[PDB]
């Protein structure tokens, strides 16, 4: 539990602070000698149970840091290392090695962190395993982009019989709206049902001209509820209704649900259908079912499947994805080798790491006194 | 009395067992993980699922013991040959701890499984746990000498065992040399081990203390680190870099105590001393004043610091349930008698296995051919019961219950195909030709010291490596 | 843009006007230190 | 400011140190009793050893080497703790004077009755499962309970922001006042309370005063205070008084009471007191005082009422989980989300059961047609090498119908899987794999003259299942109907007397 | 100390000589036994063992209780026999690693100590039961291998007196084998075949109990606590220093 | 019937000859009785249960 270090110019160097179990023996053995320097520190001391950060520690993490106590003795010329990477697992054992780390540094050395010397250390949160293929992503967007990507990775739609197949950039592009409209859609959950505004992209638009009759509308919200309850699986009754506007004679669709007992109403009023949500909304909606016809293909590499509509299309995409490999989420460093916190975290070329605002050592503060006042 | 039992008690829970080299725990955890279908071709398991089942099933006592077990047959520097594939972080010889039991992944070493072959076959004798709900195997069926190949250490007081982990290849070869002749001279089995061999390299001081230690049972052998002296080509000062150091030595204990002893005065001639080791490789550093000489100061420290540390070896283990203390001889011959019992126990299993199969597949084409008789004979009665109350030839004849009735009634359909015929056919032809070789193997004793002799081959070729430690003698 | 004092409680506005941010005096920051040397800055979870 | 981070954490923390309301459970009581599920630990089957279920709980749900499980399994088989015990213990499972519980080698334990109950339908897609911390293994975000568990076994537990404690009640009178709520939603807090008058303790003891339990019933928080039953006994023939205490407030520490009786009257804050013995045994509780010849016994008594926890006050604050945030709800409330579980899990359950039936129908029609159509496919598929070849020709042809009368006698539209496309099945022409596969792997044990006969009669049965479960799900008031017998079962399975007396002021 | 409340559960009757102490493994049978046994006759004493530093030790808190809730002195001339508070102290532990150092410490706190309480015959040893079969609606308790096997045959046989005589002469020769005329006897009078067709007819659930914490209150006090169907052994001198042999080899 | 004094190693031999049995002097005695409530008497820990994460 003491410090090492190669290089002297504190330009070039840098130091970690890791937690002795999970990543002491890692980063021992997987450091690159010249310009790292790191610390191994025991995140729970005894005490008679188990919990906190050490006196002694705290004496030489100082001195490792190297540059002085306070404001008044800060010294730029005497850090020793100008990047200090608190690679701490994370969860909240770990969070807590990594808050008082930053606690201790707002409180006597808030320079270190203002003059952005505090950098943090990011490790991978997946790791993707098919067969042959092993590979790094580091966040959940990455996942995201990785998962369509093999999604579509040499795969098209046939549309109408056997018409122009679609595929490449049109079909990305094409499936980038989708999902993130869906996300649009997957937000929206607490103000109306997702499954009546994805019946929303699928079924016709209604413009406030429309609203401006009255036929048309209850044509519109029956075909909607219609559709929605012969498509139902959880056993959800759709019933509709259209209230009277006094003023303009505006009419606006309402549409009732009886989800477990729950009869519950759901209006949809001007403002909705004019906001731009719906607009979007409605984008996707004509590009789509203007589109896919009957007796369509969808089909990946060598398999083929016939295919109702969208949907079943890009879930047997990413079912024929899924069908060979498996992931992880990392949750601790402990769970890498060496050679992999090497490779992932620790790389200076394949690194990807965060800077702290003083606001990121102030929130720090704030969750240690929350924590201590407990 | 009570305490004689006590005594005993001890040394059955802190020695190995000659046939495997090991103790309950490394047994259990082992069996544990084989159970668990924790395989070298499968992916990964976290160390909490191992641990969690050693716990529940065998060894309930506390994580402890139990993942220190697993830790420990996972590092090189703790084992010549590895029983435990760990990814993630396994701890460092500086003393740096094991990533948490949550984080570790493990799974069975190839080495590991070969340790294990045969199992199901009844070779070995089950046991009671505590429960009693769980049988667990009092030895394993192991087709490696990992007892010699890995070494042991004696808790116990009283009794207690230190011995050494060998090279695979020169066991295995000693191994042959003792399956050909028996009452093999034990200077000739030096002849093909040479001594022990160390995960970690080092250099061995005295071969005195080595044969002294294989013929006697007990002896006393140094341990030497390689250390290597040099000076900077130009500048006319040196260096000495440790590269290498002895078996169970912490390098972060050793520098610090090298610290202390500078410190203390104890040792002059040090200028600086820093430890360089990384990945790329191990290397300890120590910076030379120009008022001293290198190789003394080397020397210095071979002496009151670990660099050079005295191994004190000592072969006690079980036998027929009783410490005894035995010869390289008498540990190479346990070891190839308890392979005899092993391959005589599953060849007579399989030999049973085949037996039954082939009455069974006899039944079946039996049925193969008595369809419609029986069909009809079957449709009749109401109740499967009562029709089972009611209830090909050439080559049973040229190539020589009613659970058979049972086993024909619990038939699919989907049998009933034309290429099922041939199939059971095949497998039949081919289950004769192994009863017949099976009983050719057990009427012959040669033949199977001989197969032995074959498996112990593929041993050494496929797991067998380099040799890792030097062995110098000048005296 | 104001900061509480961790050690006594005041408030320091932050910026140059004090040096001893987010500390009011120099003794309350040192105060801290030796908290932080006496290990008193301690996190308790339980269950 | 509350920021991003900090929430988290304050999420995490109150998740796993508040309980869901509908269960009433903690993230690691649910995974011992779940993992004592899987391990089908039941409740008439024989006992196994404590460390079985915790190495499979630490492997599977928990993986921390941390006395943590072993202390739940006891705490539940404890009867001084839990009102309703879920864990049917036997061995030394410790004592309300502090003493531990035999090593987890030597002590075995199976699931309680209730705790069947608490996890009756579980493998009828119920709840949503979750992944554990290696994605190997899934573990139930609730339970589908058929006892409230909240109110009855109560809660109780720290955490960064608000903490939990709710005391636990008779199950009878708690699902008395569900039933109540059923046949009267809207229902009003007076109202409930009818049918449960306040908290039940498993040690007994006395409450003092209604006010208190009213004021948390109707708002979820109120301060109520818990008096030991003891008693003051007079010797006839030398009037020497000799109070004893028969039983104590719930949680508190018969040794630490004692000692702090004995530090009473050793730093003579309290006077009169002779002896001070503790004469428990297998006959219950008792602890003996023996009042001095100058005092009088009331008076010490009411001391020790004064100066230890003979007395003590509960403070009640009934905070649980809603939805994936934590609330504060009074009785209602709780009654009220309880029993939208009930409605969702038997909807749940009762789709899963119809899909169940709808497959055995479709393949249990598959082998009456095989049964009618045996000499041909024998036939066909003796001539076919190949599986394959033999299930593509079963396919291939559509065949024909004492076997079809029922199946048309005995249909509605529906028998058929809700998956199940249009083209296949029944113009008096059978339109048809999966079958294929279920005649393909048929046994010969099978073919006898009276196995149809079984596989009709069950055939019918599958209807008259498949009727009564279309019958439930139609009407909401069947449902409800259902849901008052199963809880007219469950406390009809366990009702307890009340144990703890309540007097107001 | 004076007040032995709170660390001590004593007994209704005052008398010494009608009163027993009972020395109990406080991870093991203390609060089972603290609810099994009878208010008026018998005291109850948990123990443990502590680890500091680096093992098991009577610690200072309870040396204390323990010596004063024995009430003799310390010393074998300070001893008074009229200070003493029971005749009679059971030192209920278990057999394993642990349950030895406790008990066995025991004794040697009192071989050094307080000698004349092993010596006037005060203290006693507990003897649980190590059967319990239960073939399924009943059980019973059995206490030796002795009485486990006579049990045993007894139920194996459900021919004849003689059958007995024959089975006993039979296993008396097959205790010979394990450890000459009678060999012969048997030699010139198969055999086993109808004996193991006895064994599978009489084999219920066996357990072998290791521990006084698989046992319920109610259950360790029927088998090795009431004073009715009880068990227990009066340690000697030579037992004494045997523990104290066993503690000086330990140190 | 000789056995060793277990403080200082003195081989006392049992009977009224020695009335601080099986010790030699009382000084000893109290000595090993002030070990006993100093707790100085241990028993090494074997290589029965520990939890790793527990204290
Ligand atoms: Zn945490
Ligand atoms: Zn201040
Ligand atoms: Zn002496």
Same mark, same amino acid.
């Given at each position: /539990?003491? *410090?090492?270090?190669?290089?002297?110019?504190?330009?070039?160097?840098?130091?970690?602070?890791?937690?002795?179990?999970?990543?002491?023996?890692?980063?021992?053995?997987?450091?690159?000698?010249?310009?790292?320097?790191?610390?191994?520190?025991?995140?729970?001391?005894?005490?008679?149970?188990?919990?906190?950060?050490?006196?002694?520690?705290?004496?030489?993490?100082?001195? *490792?840091?190297?540059?002085?106590?306070?404001?008044?003795?800060?010294?730029?010329?005497?850090?020793?290392?100008?990047?200090?990477?608190?690679?701490?697992?994370?969860?909240?054992?770990?969070?807590?090695?990594?808050?008082?780390?930053?606690?201790?540094?707002?409180?006597?050395?808030?320079?270190?962190?203002?003059?952005?010397?505090?950098?943090?250390?990011?490790?991978?949160?997946?790791?993707?395993?098919?067969?042959?293929?092993?590979?790094?992503?580091?966040?959940?967007?990455?996942?995201?982009?990785?998962?369509?990507?093999?999604?579509?990775?040499?795969?098209?739609?046939?549309?109408?019989?056997?018409?122009?197949?679609?595929?490449?950039?049109?079909?990305?592009?094409?499936?980038?709206?989708?999902?993130?409209?869906?996300?649009?859609?997957?937000?929206?959950?607490?103000?109306?049902?997702?499954?009546?505004?994805?019946?929303?992209?699928?079924?016709?638009?209604?413009?406030?001209?429309?609203?401006?009759?009255?036929?048309?509308?209850?044509?519109?919200?029956?075909?909607?509820?219609?559709?929605?309850?012969?498509?139902?699986?959880?056993?959800?009754?759709?019933?509709?209704?259209?209230?009277?506007?006094?003023?303009?004679?505006?009419?606006?669709?309402?549409?009732?649900?009886?989800?477990?007992?729950?009869?519950?109403?759901?209006?949809?009023?001007?403002?909705?259908?004019?906001?731009?949500?719906?607009?979007?909304?409605?984008?996707?909606?004509?590009?789509?079912?203007?589109?896919?016809?009957?007796?369509?293909?969808?089909?990946?590499?060598?398999?083929?499947?016939?295919?109702?509509?969208?949907?079943?299309?890009?879930?047997?995409?990413?079912?024929?994805?899924?069908?060979?490999?498996?992931?992880?989420?990392?949750?601790?460093?402990?769970?890498?080798?060496?050679?992999?916190?090497?490779?992932?975290?620790?790389?200076?070329?394949?690194?990807?790491?965060?800077?702290?605002?003083?606001?990121?050592?102030?929130?720090?503060?704030?969750?240690?006194?929350?924590?201590?006042?407990? | 009395?009570?305490?004689?039992?006590?005594?005993?008690?001890?040394?059955?829970?802190?020695?190995?067992?000659?046939?495997?080299?090991?103790?309950?725990?490394?047994?259990?955890?082992?069996?544990?993980?084989?159970?668990?279908?924790?395989?070298?071709?499968?992916?990964? /398991?976290?160390?909490?699922?191992?641990?969690?089942?050693?716990?529940?099933?065998?060894?309930?006592?506390?994580?402890?013991?139990?993942?220190?077990?697993?830790?420990?047959?996972?590092?090189?520097?703790?084992?010549?040959?590895?029983?435990?594939?760990?990814?993630?972080?396994?701890?460092?010889?500086?003393?740096?701890?094991?990533?948490?039991?949550?984080?570790?992944?493990?799974?069975?070493?190839?080495?590991?499984?070969?340790?294990?072959?045969?199992?199901?076959?009844?070779?070995?004798?089950?046991?009671?746990?505590?429960?009693?709900?769980?049988?667990?195997?009092?030895?394993?069926?192991?087709?490696?000498?990992?007892?010699?190949?890995?070494?042991?250490?004696?808790?116990?007081?009283?009794?207690?065992?230190?011995?050494?982990?060998?090279?695979?290849?020169?066991?295995?070869?000693?191994?042959?040399?003792?399956?050909?002749?028996?009452?093999?001279?034990?200077?000739?089995?030096?002849?093909?081990?040479?001594?022990?061999?160390?995960?970690?390299?080092?250099?061995?001081?005295?071969?005195?203390?080595?044969?002294?230690?294989?013929?006697?049972?007990?002896?006393?052998?140094?341990?030497?680190?390689?250390?290597?002296?040099?000076?900077? *080509?130009?500048?006319?000062?040196?260096?000495?870099?440790?590269?290498?150091?002895?078996?169970?030595?912490?390098?972060?204990?050793?520098?610090?105590?090298?610290?202390?002893?500078?410190?203390?005065?104890?040792?002059?001639?040090?200028?600086?001393?820093?430890?360089?080791?990384?990945?790329?490789?191990?290397?300890?550093?120590?910076?030379?004043?120009?008022?001293?000489?290198?190789?003394?100061?080397?020397?210095?420290?071979?002496?009151?610091?670990?660099?050079?540390?005295?191994?004190?070896?000592?072969?006690?283990?079980?036998?027929?349930?009783?410490?005894?203390?035995?010869?390289?001889?008498?540990?190479?011959?346990?070891?190839?008698?308890?392979?005899?019992?092993?391959?005589?126990?599953?060849?007579?299993?399989?030999?049973?296995?085949?037996?039954?199969?082939?009455?069974?597949?006899?039944?079946?084409?039996?049925?193969?051919?008595?369809?419609?008789?029986?069909?009809?004979?079957?449709?009749?009665?109401?109740?499967?019961?009562?029709?089972?109350?009611?209830?090909?030839? *050439?080559?049973?004849?040229?190539?020589?219950?009613?659970?058979?009735?049972?086993?024909?009634?619990?038939?699919?359909?989907?049998?009933?195909?034309?290429?099922?015929?041939?199939?059971?056919?095949?497998?039949?032809?081919?289950?004769?030709?192994?009863?017949?070789?099976?009983?050719?193997?057990?009427?012959?004793?040669?033949?199977?010291?001989?197969?032995?002799?074959?498996?112990?081959?593929?041993?050494?070729?496929?797991?067998?490596?380099?040799?890792?430690?030097?062995?110098?003698?000048?005296? | 843009?104001?900061?509480?004092?961790?050690?006594?409680?005041?408030?320091?506005?932050?910026?140059?006007?004090?040096?001893?941010?987010?500390?009011?005096?120099?003794?309350?920051?040192?105060?801290?230190?030796?908290?932080?040397?006496?290990?008193?800055?301690?996190?308790?979870?339980?269950?």
């Amino acid at each position: /539990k003491l *410090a090492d270090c190669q290089e002297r110019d504190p330009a070039l160097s840098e130091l970690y602070l890791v937690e002795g179990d999970s990543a002491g023996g890692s980063a021992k053995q997987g450091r690159n000698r010249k310009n790292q320097a790191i610390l191994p520190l025991k995140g729970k001391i005894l005490n008679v149970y188990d919990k906190m950060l050490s006196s002694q520690e705290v004496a030489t993490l100082i001195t *490792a840091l190297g540059c002085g106590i306070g404001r008044d003795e800060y010294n730029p010329d005497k850090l020793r290392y100008h990047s200090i990477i608190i690679m701490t697992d994370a969860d909240v054992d770990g969070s807590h090695i990594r808050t008082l780390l930053l606690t201790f540094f707002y409180r006597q050395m808030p320079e270190i962190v203002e003059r952005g010397h505090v950098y943090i250390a990011q490790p991978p949160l997946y790791k993707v395993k098919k067969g042959k293929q092993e590979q790094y992503i580091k966040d959940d967007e990455a996942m995201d982009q990785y998962q369509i990507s093999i999604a579509l990775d040499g795969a098209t739609l046939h549309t109408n019989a056997s018409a122009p197949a679609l595929a490449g950039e049109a079909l990305e592009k094409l499936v980038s709206e989708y999902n993130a409209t869906q996300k649009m859609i997957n937000r929206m959950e607490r103000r109306y049902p997702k499954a009546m505004l994805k019946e929303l992209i699928y079924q016709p638009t209604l413009t406030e001209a429309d609203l401006s009759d009255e036929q048309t509308v209850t044509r519109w919200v029956n075909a909607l509820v219609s559709e929605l309850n012969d498509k139902e699986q959880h056993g959800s009754q759709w019933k509709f209704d259209v209230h009277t506007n006094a003023e303009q004679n505006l009419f606006e669709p309402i549409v009732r649900v009886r989800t477990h007992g729950v009869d519950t109403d759901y209006p949809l009023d001007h403002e909705f259908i004019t906001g731009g949500e719906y607009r979007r909304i409605c984008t996707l909606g004509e590009k789509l079912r203007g589109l896919l016809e009957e007796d369509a293909f969808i089909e990946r590499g060598e398999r083929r499947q016939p295919v109702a509509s969208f949907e079943q299309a890009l879930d047997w995409l990413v079912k024929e994805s899924r069908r060979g490999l498996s992931i992880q989420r990392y949750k601790g460093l402990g769970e890498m080798n060496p050679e992999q916190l090497w490779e992932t975290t620790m790389d200076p070329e394949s690194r990807r790491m965060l800077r702290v605002t003083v606001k990121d050592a102030i929130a720090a503060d704030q969750l240690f006194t929350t924590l201590m006042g407990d | 009395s009570y305490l004689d039992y006590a005594m005993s008690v001890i040394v059955g829970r802190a020695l190995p067992d000659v046939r495997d080299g090991l103790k309950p725990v490394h047994r259990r955890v082992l069996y544990a993980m084989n159970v668990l279908g924790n395989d070298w071709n499968k992916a990964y /398991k976290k160390s909490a699922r191992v641990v969690g089942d050693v716990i529940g099933k065998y060894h309930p006592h506390g994580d402890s013991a139990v993942y220190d077990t697993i830790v420990r047959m996972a590092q090189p520097f703790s084992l010549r040959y590895m029983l435990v594939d760990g990814q993630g972080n396994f701890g460092s010889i500086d003393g740096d701890s094991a990533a948490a039991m949550r984080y570790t992944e493990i799974r069975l070493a190839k080495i590991a499984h070969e340790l294990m072959a045969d199992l199901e076959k009844e070779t070995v004798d089950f046991v009671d746990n505590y429960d009693g709900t769980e049988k667990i195997p009092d030895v394993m069926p192991t087709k490696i000498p990992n007892l010699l190949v890995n070494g042991s250490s004696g808790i116990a007081v009283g009794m207690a065992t230190n011995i050494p982990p060998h090279n695979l290849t020169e066991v295995i070869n000693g191994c042959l040399a003792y399956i050909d002749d028996e009452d093999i001279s034990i200077e000739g089995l030096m002849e093909h081990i040479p001594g022990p061999d160390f995960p970690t390299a080092a250099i061995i001081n005295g071969r005195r203390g080595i044969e002294e230690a294989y013929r006697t049972g007990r002896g006393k052998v140094y341990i030497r680190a390689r250390a290597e002296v040099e000076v900077d *080509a130009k500048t006319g000062r040196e260096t000495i870099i440790v590269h290498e150091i002895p078996y169970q030595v912490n390098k972060a204990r050793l520098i610090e105590k090298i610290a202390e002893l500078v410190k203390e005065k104890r040792v002059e001639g040090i200028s600086a001393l820093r430890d360089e080791s990384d990945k790329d490789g191990m290397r300890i550093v120590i910076e030379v004043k120009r008022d001293a000489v290198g190789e003394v100061v080397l020397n210095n420290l071979y002496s009151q610091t670990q660099l050079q540390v005295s191994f004190g070896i000592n072969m006690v283990a079980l036998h027929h349930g009783q410490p005894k203390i035995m010869n390289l001889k008498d540990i190479i011959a346990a070891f190839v008698r308890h392979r005899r019992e092993v391959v005589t126990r599953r060849t007579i299993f399989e030999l049973r296995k085949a037996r039954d199969r082939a009455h069974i597949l006899e039944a079946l084409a039996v049925a193969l051919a008595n369809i419609d008789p029986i069909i009809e004979l079957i449709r009749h009665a109401p109740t499967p019961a009562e029709a089972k109350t009611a209830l090909v030839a *050439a080559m049973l004849e040229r190539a020589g219950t009613e659970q058979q009735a049972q086993a024909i009634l619990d038939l699919r359909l989907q049998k009933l195909t034309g290429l099922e015929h041939e199939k059971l056919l095949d497998e039949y032809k081919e289950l004769l030709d192994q009863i017949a070789e099976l009983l050719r193997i057990l009427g012959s004793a040669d033949r199977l010291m001989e197969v032995i002799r074959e498996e112990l081959e593929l041993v050494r070729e496929q797991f067998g490596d380099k040799r890792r430690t030097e062995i110098t003698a000048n005296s | 843009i104001t900061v509480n004092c961790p050690t006594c409680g005041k408030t320091v506005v932050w910026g140059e006007i004090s040096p001893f941010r987010p500390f009011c005096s120099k003794r309350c920051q040192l105060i801290d230190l030796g908290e932080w040397a006496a290990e008193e800055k301690r996190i308790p979870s339980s269950g």
